[PDB]
Amino acid sequence: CLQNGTRLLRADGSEVLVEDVQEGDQLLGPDGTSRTASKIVRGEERLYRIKTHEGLEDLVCTHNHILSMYKERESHERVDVTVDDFVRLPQQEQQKYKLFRSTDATLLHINSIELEEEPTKWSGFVVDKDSLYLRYDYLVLHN
Numbered sequence: 819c820l821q822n823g824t825r826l827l828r829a830d831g832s833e834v835l836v837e838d839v840q841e842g843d844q845l846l847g848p849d850g851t852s853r854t855a856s857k858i859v860r861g862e863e864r865l866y867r868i869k870t871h872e873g874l875e876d877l878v879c880t881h882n883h884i885l886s887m888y889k890e891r892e893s894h895e896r897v898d899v900t901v902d903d904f905v906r907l908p909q910q911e912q913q914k915y916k917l918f919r920s921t922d923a924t925l926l927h928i929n930s931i932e933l934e935e936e937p938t939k940w941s942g943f944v945v946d947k948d949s950l951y952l953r954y955d956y957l958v959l960h961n
Contacts, residue, residue, distance in 0.1 A: 819940045820879050820883070826959075828843070828846060830844075833954050839943055841855070842854060848948075853951050857942075860939065860942070864936065864937050864938075868901075871926075872923075883960075885899055887916060894916065899915065917957060920958055945961050
């Protein structure tokens, strides 16, 4: 699940804040097709902040949120990993994993991932099909 205020893409290309996503809403998938959201849930807790080397907005999300990544050795394979499991990996293993944006340097290198010191509100939902959808800057996100 994602920090409130995270900007996502509707299926029509306009932006919607994650907490404004409602049941049945259509989001944009990484291949360009529609995704249906359901099971809207909300809570409040200390989230993890992920910062990239590249100048993109931080991703802030719950400890059980699933990151969709590319892992080295094309050149990279698709892997899903929870924030908890990724956080606990040794940094030499972590550097093999990259976030990514949907094509049309699309890999993003994580510079830091840290637990925040105060709780903040988050919103989550499930997405059909491959469970992938787009942030406003085309970062690929998972359920």
